[PDB]
Amino acid sequence: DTQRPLDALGKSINTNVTVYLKDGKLVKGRLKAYDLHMNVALENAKIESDEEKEFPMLVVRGDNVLYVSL
Amino acid sequence: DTQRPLDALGKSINTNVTVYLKDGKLVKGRLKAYDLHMNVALENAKIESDEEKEFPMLVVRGDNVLYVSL
Amino acid sequence: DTQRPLDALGKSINTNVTVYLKDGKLVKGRLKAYDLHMNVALENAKIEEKEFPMLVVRGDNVLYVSL
Amino acid sequence: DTQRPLDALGKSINTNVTVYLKDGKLVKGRLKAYDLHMNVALENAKIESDEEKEFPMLVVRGDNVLYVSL
Amino acid sequence: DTQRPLDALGKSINTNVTVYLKDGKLVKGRLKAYDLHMNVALENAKIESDEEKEFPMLVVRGDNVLYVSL
Amino acid sequence: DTQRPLDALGKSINTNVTVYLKDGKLVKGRLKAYDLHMNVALENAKIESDEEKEFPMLVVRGDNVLYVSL
Amino acid sequence: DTQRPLDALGKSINTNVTVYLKDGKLVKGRLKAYDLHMNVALENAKIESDEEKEFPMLVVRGDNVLYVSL
Numbered sequence A, B, D, E, F, G: 001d002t003q004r005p006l007d008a009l010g011k012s013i014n015t016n017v018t019v020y021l022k023d024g025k026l027v028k029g030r031l032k033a034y035d036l037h038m039n040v041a042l043e044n045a046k047i048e049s050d051e052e053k054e055f056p057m058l059v060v061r062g063d064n065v066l067y068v069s070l
Numbered sequence C: 001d002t003q004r005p006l007d008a009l010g011k012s013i014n015t016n017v018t019v020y021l022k023d024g025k026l027v028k029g030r031l032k033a034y035d036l037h038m039n040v041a042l043e044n045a046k047i048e049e050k051e052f053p054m055l056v057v058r059g060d061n062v063l064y065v066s067l
Ligand SMILES: [Ca+2]
Pocket: B015, B016, B017, B069, B070
């Protein structure tokens, strides 16, 4: 709907999304949940730098978000 | 309406807009949705300085927005 | 009314105003609309050419508005 | 009343005040209106960045305010 | 009451307090009023490092406050 | 539930979590409580900037939170 | 209660706590009051940086708080 841009997050549940953060971080992961604050829960998340690190479950606070690429 | 500046986003649904962000980024895309926080959903979005990177769907958190060119 | 400072924008609708932003930008343009957040819609706007038919400015960026 | 600090602005309506801003600016002008966000309307406003432009009418966003000298 | 920290401000009404600001300023003055945002009204306010800068009445926006010394 | 990202915190009650803060700090501890602001009470908590002290109870203010690793 | 993290502050009333602020300050004193914004009233407070200044009663604005150590 033209007035609910966060509904696009719902269409991406159980896919990999890229959450860009204000501080320049890129957080990629499997979107498990999101709310109207754009808080999100990401499964098996990875931070673009530094790499190698692995996050079974990551809850990202919405206010840190720049944009989400679905 | 002189009291509803965001109604101008409603008249630009499915057009190309440029969202200027507080950090200097320019995001161009087709406006699919917006809410009263100025969250916007941009289809086939593009950010300058990174040309050939393209985002099929970018959900932009309103609090990062400087202004929106319609 | 001494308690409605934003009514000054209502009296400036369809006139040229200058929006000063927190970053030092001066956005000039014709005021079409505003809200209690101080979001504004500016018609035929400039940032001192590069011109914008319609620019919707988010209120939390505003320093002050010259009417 | 001791629970209403912004009533001091009410006692200074139509007098000259100095609005100190977070960024170090000082704005002087005659106080025509204020609200509970500390938004203020200033007539014949001068900013000490230049002492020759008298803005007929300046509306200052309250969240930029450090303090107001009455 | 142990759930109303700002009631301590109430016990300092019409006495001298020091308001520490986020940016490192100290503002001293006689507390006339305060609200739940920690906006405060100060009579005969002085800033510590500007000895001669005197203010008959200063209204301080509370979101600049670090803490208040009573 | 796909609309309740913070329920992942409720499942992590009485387990060890890592709270990443906006300033780069990492706070690690046993999660006893959280709220919809992402305030969290952490028992026997450790700062990686000091991984020797074991604070009996740390209440972290959620507005500082970048993401929590669960 | 697992959804009331600030209740831990209520358990610490009239004991000595240490409030960590975002600017790196540590404020120690006896907790007399708190509220849901994490404003706190600290009696006979001390700041680690300047351990010679007494603060008989300090009201600290919650938005400056990093975490409280109980
Ligand atoms: Ca267009």
